[PDB]
Amino acid sequence: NPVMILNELRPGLKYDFLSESGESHAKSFVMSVVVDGQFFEGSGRNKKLAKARAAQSALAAIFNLHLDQTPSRQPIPSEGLQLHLPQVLADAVSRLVLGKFGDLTDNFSSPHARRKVLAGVVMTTGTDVKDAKVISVSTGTKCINGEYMSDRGLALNDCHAEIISRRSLLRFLYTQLELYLNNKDDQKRSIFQKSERGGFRLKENVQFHLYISTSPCGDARIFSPHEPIARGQLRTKIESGQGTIPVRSNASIQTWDGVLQGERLLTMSCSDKIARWNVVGIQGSLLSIFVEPIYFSSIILGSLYHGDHLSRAMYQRISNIEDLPPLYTLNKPLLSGISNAEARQPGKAPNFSVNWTVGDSAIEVINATTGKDELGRASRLCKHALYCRWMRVHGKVPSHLLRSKITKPNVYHESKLAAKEYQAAKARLFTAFIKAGLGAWVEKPTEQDQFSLT
Amino acid sequence: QLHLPQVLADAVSRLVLGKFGDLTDNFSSPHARRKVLAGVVMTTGTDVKDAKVISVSTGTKCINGEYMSDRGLALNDCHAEIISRRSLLRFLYTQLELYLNNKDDQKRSIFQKSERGGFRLKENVQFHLYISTSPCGDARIFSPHEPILEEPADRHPNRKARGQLRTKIESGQGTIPVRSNASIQTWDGVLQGERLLTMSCSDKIARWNVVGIQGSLLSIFVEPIYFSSIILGSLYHGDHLSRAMYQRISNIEDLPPLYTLNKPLLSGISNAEARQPGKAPNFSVNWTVGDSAIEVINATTGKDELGRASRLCKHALYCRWMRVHGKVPSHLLRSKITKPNVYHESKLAAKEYQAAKARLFTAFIKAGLGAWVEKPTEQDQFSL
RNA sequence: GCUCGCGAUGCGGAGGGCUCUGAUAGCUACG
Ligand SMILES: O=P(O)(O)O[C@H]1[C@H](OP(=O)(O)O)[C@@H](OP(=O)(O)O)[C@H](OP(=O)(O)O)[C@@H](OP(=O)(O)O)[C@H]1OP(=O)(O)O
Ligand SMILES: O=P(O)(O)O[C@H]1[C@H](OP(=O)(O)O)[C@@H](OP(=O)(O)O)[C@H](OP(=O)(O)O)[C@@H](OP(=O)(O)O)[C@H]1OP(=O)(O)O
Ligand SMILES: [Zn+2]
Ligand SMILES: [Zn+2]
């Protein structure tokens, strides 16, 4: 027990009750202790657990760590140890994401903070804790239903939270480029530099770290969390709320006018999409035609972390990949849970994907099941708007800086196909997953990318 | 003594009570704290003397969503009558191993080789289910209280909610209908807070009334075994129970042979079991005949108080099944279907039982009564 | 006979807070 040992070691101790929240199931408590002058805190649905986590924090800092379930450890990053310690980094990103989300919901008061899954991207420029800047914040645990998909790319396909935070990341990255391609003094303010290998790369020691409030659906979550000691397949999401199911690598694919008869559009799980990001980067197709591939250095799970299954889900299950294009590589980022893991909350999921990016005034609330915003308007994150920002970029970029020949863009899918190298790394990932025996990525019909800014 | 239904009813109630008290220090053990008793007794001849208690259990609760095991070590449903059947399965494997011990011993087993292949029950042996109350789902929900004998009976038999398959629902009161909009749960989804669905006990007892009570693994050895009577200690409503046990699905057809729509005797006792005051215990005790003493499982974890798996979980029973399998000649098998030694698959080797299950499933679907709700199949894939 | 909507009175597994009793294991002070 933590409070037992903490109150025998420093018996002259007094804990403090800060605030509460929620009602019914939803109820969250923060308790803060101060032992030897140093302050600590912890969180849980009842007061005794919040105090227990504060006591655990005090113990692990001042004295030492308690007898720990070893799967709750952390795989270290690919090449280096350069942003403080893994658990301290992870706790930092948890607090930062929660902080900005509080700001965006008027300190968790606003009706849109009633979320089931929180995700965020944070950016680190260096070792100092002061170089931390929250890049985007997102919630949501649902997806567009088939009959609300737009052939014009004005409706959001996948509103799962971590996905929405990646798309917000993309907005931030495009704006970073808009900053670079203006007053030529603003280029030292940018996050980018001109790549010697042509195009654009990132300044030294600019790291993006991913935080999800839970283990991402799909393969990273298929375990019994109360008994550690197992196939790694691909899974599609399901039309009924949250959850995923395996694929069949040999049968029959779908259509695009098929949400009107029987055999619908499946959407890939979040663990599979995050392995995708760990091979082809996070910039995606169009943005690759501008910048060198970008990967995350860390992944932080606020709950349901397990080192073995997370590791399998993020990179291990595609060890067998080879023939990686230049600048590409299978990304083995930092995996780490947190200390005060969030607790399960039985009940249905929201129909809303709220999102936000640094520089934006307020959040944006999307109806997940329709893929458009609360007032029927297309998002700032759907395919069409991202194409439009990328077109703003293509206009300003000198053509000798491009990473491929796309100086005549008309439609979305063709501009996508203009990334030879990227789509090559894609094809390598797909054959790596098939030859691994795990499945054939469900390719969404091309007919929703057949739009232009026309 | 050739019985009227009451007689046999009051008898089996008496027996299961007495056995329970014997196991719990004459109802003085702290493990006698219960809201729902339920047992199974055997008869071998119409005389109050030669008929004995196979199992007894207690419990009102089901496993938490995040505690379910991919190794078949946790117990999901511990409503007393579900646990009582699982105890009966333990007794059935013991009786098989008694047959398989030697030929002098075969004489005392309740099975015999059967003409169709495999084993069958000896004539004049049969089983009786007792429950202190009515099973959740369709035989209770509409009147969870005693019938006021002034009050006749259900005055809206034809409401669409009569006979619907309903599921227990995690962190929530009551038994929810299915609607044939029966989108099966996922594993990752349940871990992330989607609530865990478990078919209601009247639904399971209808299922045991079409496919027997031995499940698929045991059916690979034994012609299907059905209850003969269902005795309720309280809340007995004849019309609701008769609907929810067999009558719902009297539209069922094309059952595999030896399977049928078993319509057992339903009876209430003479004088009801009285409401137990206090909080409902979160544990469930279980006892099979020929056991040193009770076992006590925490309902919300599906494991005992020290975290060790139960003599009743999927895994324990798969081990029992494997013990008998290794001793049953390939000629005495009721299915010579080879399937890999992993739990889900081994179940699949029971072709006839899976057929009769599918027939029951469409019987419920076609009656307008919704479609069954399987567990995330990720649960049933393991080995030893 | 039902169905759907809206009321109303009731019936049937989670979470949180407090109060009291008992036992356990440590911890002090005291004579
Ligand atoms: O972040 P997501 O919601 O998962 O969206 C992605 C993203 O689509 P957009 O960038 O057009 O919004 C991919 O873009 P790229 O990585 O290629 O840049 C696209 O990839 P494809 O070009 O392979 O189609 C993929 O589509 P798919 O599902 O076919 O892999 C699609 O996923 P969703 O359809 O789930 O939104
Ligand atoms: O009703 P229970 O006593 O809880 O056990 C049953 C039993 O599974 P086990 O005997 O392996 O524990 C069923 O299997 P059979 O005995 O009929 O072969 C299984 O059904 P399936 O075989 O159709 O999977 C069903 O679960 P479900 O129907 O939801 O999958 C499961 O009941 P629980 O789900 O409540 O454990
Ligand atoms: Zn997801
Ligand atoms: Zn029940």
Author numbering:
A (entry chain B): 235 to 463, 476 to 700
B (entry chain A): 316 to 699
The authors write:
Adenosine Deaminases Acting on RNA (ADARs) are members of a family of RNA editing enzymes that catalyze the conversion of adenosine into inosine in double-stranded RNA (dsRNA). Critical in the mechanism of the ADAR reaction, a loop in the protein (i.e., the base-flipping loop) approaches the site of reaction on the dsRNA from the minor groove and the side chain of a glutamic acid (Glu488) present on this loop flips the targeted A into the active site and fills the vacated space. We identify additional nucleoside analogs that accomplish this in vitro and in cellulo and report a proposed mechanism of action for these analogs based on crystal structures of a truncated homodimer of human ADAR2 bound to dsRNA substrates containing 2′-deoxyinosine or a base-expanded cytidine analog (dyC) paired to the 5′-G.
X-ray crystallography was used to resolve the structure of the ADAR2-R2D E488Q protein bound to an RNA duplex containing a target sequence derived from human glioma-associated oncogene 1 (hGLI1) and a guide oligonucleotide that forms a dI/G pair adjacent to the editing site. The dI/G pair adjacent to the edit site is well defined and shows the 5′-G in the syn conformation with its Hoogsteen face accepting hydrogen bond donation from the protonated N1 of dI. The interaction appears to involve a bifurcated hydrogen bond with N1 of dI donating a strong hydrogen bond to N7 of 5′-G and a slightly weaker hydrogen bond to O6. In addition, superimposition of the dI/G pair with the G/G pair clearly shows the benefit of removing the −1 G 2-amino in the minor groove in creating space for the flipping loop. This may explain the lower in vitro deamination rates on substrates containing a −1 dI.
